[PDB]
Design a protein around this ligand. Sequence first.
Ligand code: PL6
Ligand code: PL6
Lengths: 412, 410
Amino acid sequence: EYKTKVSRNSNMSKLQAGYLFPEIARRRSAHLLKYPDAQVISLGIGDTTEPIPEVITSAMAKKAHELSTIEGYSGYGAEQGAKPLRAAIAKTFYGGLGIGDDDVFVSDGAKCDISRLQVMFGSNVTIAVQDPSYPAYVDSSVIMGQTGQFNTDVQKYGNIEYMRCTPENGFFPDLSTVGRTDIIFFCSPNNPTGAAATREQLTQLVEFAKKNGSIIVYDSAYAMYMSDDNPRSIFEIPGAEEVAMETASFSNYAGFTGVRLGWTVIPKKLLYSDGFPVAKDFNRIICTCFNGASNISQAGALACLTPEGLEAMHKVIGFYKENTNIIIDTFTSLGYDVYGGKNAPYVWVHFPNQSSWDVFAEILEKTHVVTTPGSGFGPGGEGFVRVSAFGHRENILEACRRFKQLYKHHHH
Amino acid sequence: EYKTKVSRNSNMSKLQAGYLFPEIARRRSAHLLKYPDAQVISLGIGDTTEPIPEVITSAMAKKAHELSTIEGYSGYGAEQGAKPLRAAIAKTFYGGLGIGDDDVFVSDGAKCDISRLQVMFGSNVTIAVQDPSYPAYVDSSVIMGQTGQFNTDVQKYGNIEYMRCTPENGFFPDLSTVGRTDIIFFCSPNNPTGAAATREQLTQLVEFAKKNGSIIVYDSAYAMYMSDDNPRSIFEIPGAEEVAMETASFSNYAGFTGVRLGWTVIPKKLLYSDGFPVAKDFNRIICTCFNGASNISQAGALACLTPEGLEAMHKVIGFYKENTNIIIDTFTSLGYDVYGGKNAPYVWVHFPNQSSWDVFAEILEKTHVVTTPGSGFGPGGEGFVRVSAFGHRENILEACRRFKQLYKHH
Ligand SMILES: Cc1ncc(COP(=O)(O)O)c(/C=N/[C@@H](CCC(=O)O)C(=O)O)c1O
Ligand SMILES: Cc1ncc(COP(=O)(O)O)c(/C=N/[C@@H](CCC(=O)O)C(=O)O)c1O
């Protein structure tokens, strides 16, 4: 066979396996070959399942129809997003926090922004992540050349600061033990643990970033699930404007997982070591490497940020929070240590003295329920399994019945 | 003022100015501050202007409504795109060319794929581009660290092979003069020259890539504007499957510039030097750095690839081709050397003894028409101006009247 003379990107070669969620899909498929009649319930990937509220879909359909009219047609949008949408995001989520319309960048989702931010930061920054954490932070870092090779002894890529979050530290890093890095990716409520940082903890985080001269990338994709009285935006912490940016999404709020609409906020006071504003480089990236979020998706997001849209999202979120409570109650009654669930639409179940991949496999094999093994979120996730609360009510209830039957004999 | 201790990405520092099209928009905005009541006609950025056909928008509206129902709701899609859409693209544009549904990757547009491909290739590849060419190829290369600094003497970033395309050579490079690189970005029809490579020229290009062990990134964003009997896909050239991939979009075909939907095709026989299939690394990038094109946009694209959708696109394309002829005739009658327009919805006009930014500024100040300075497309673009044919018919006619009035006595 013919081969080119182009060398494979050595950063791609560093990756240990495929992306976590496609790997789970492969195991789900293999399971269906083994059990063709199985009624599989997926509580693995956090994919929303309930319909989008009509007030929001109606706005998207209206935009689509408008595109067939002379007056209503629009072509390229400014890559930063429609001004009324930037304004609505700035006021709804950041009113009172000194965030301007021009600080908001509308995306086709948080996953995509994480990687565009990584292109922006480039190959020479070092990063810290919560351990465990959403795997895209680590994987994007490896792809960009910010890491060394994977070390199989410790299950870590070289040169990443993995900040261990455990039951014993309340799922917040012991910052006095964390080495200095350029970037700190910090998710609150955390995926997969569900832990929401308190005001005191976020204050510590901002102080740590300030002393170390680091940039915090704060992922607030589940913040509207907050039940405890904790900050929902990093910008609630005075000084955050000098060290932090925030990335978020409509995926988990309106069921926009397939529609694609998020945003990133970069404040004016966030500067590189030479005084250059970080937002100006992000603006160059989003103008050069992106051509804007879908106009229909932007119209849907604008409709979300109205009294009727907010009411609708609140109902969607409330439904998933009720699913979460059903799952928490099930595992608690089974005698498990169950974490998260309070501030996030998933639960983090402790399966000590087992491999999380083994637990994943056992649950799938015996109950036909897909979960996510904790080790998929980094070595700090070993010993845990994440169970998503996204599902139709009957599917949640059925999965819990199956869990109760599987684990009935494990505890008194 | 507080500053972090994070060093700015040195690749961002390399960029000589802002991205071309936002800079044009800034100048347009400045013009409207100067003259608030100016009736500005925008022929700079290639932004489509005519409505999307109803058959296509109806499909998008239907998908939106379906998302509010239990049965019709869908969440995350496959990051590669819906299988029926991949199948429709594969058969419609590549039927008979040995392209499978799994070779197609649905994107939110060609600009985005160019940059995701560049993340995939990484910092250690060298690139070649046509000179002039669409500026994203060069700027994405700089951002990814594949280049040196901008050299102001020659108006080139270091370590990029700029392939000279001129009226004299029919805007196809003399490949005997082109140095070996890892990647060759090649646009046909080319933006901004409008030049469509002939079958013979593409055969040369494929042979050149094969000898050099290079990967061609073929951008076919304007291929449906082809009037001459030239290949529309690189895969029409036997052997392309070993050396080429193709990126395209619905932007210029259905007016999806704001809707966002394109694709890339990476064939099975395209391998790195270690035998690793390039498509497998692209798949990892689109699974890790992307979450799929919008489900509504995918539904729109699926409706495009039907008899009614193709008919509707053909009509829109035809309208813009008519606009292009109006523009060609205007500049030709004024005595300018005008290139392109035959196979693409823009014209490439030669303005001797003048910088293209000065011509841009003069045209905007005097006629309130926005154009694109040729130098924005690389050093080979100096002395030229691109005029887009995307516009309402009355605006094209008005712009041409303004050009004639300005230039007829000179
Ligand atoms: C902390 C966090 N940040 C970003 C994302 C991606 O959100 P979008 O790209 O806007 O849908 C997600 C979504 N995570 C899901 C979906 C998986 C994925 O996006 O790869 C999960 O962990 O199952 C997330 O949890
Ligand atoms: C050769 C070529 N390749 C890709 C694109 C971008 O297409 P999409 O991102 O799918 O809308 C374009 C679009 N160019 C326009 C819009 C400018 C831009 O995309 O930045 C222009 O040249 O005016 C292009 O010309």
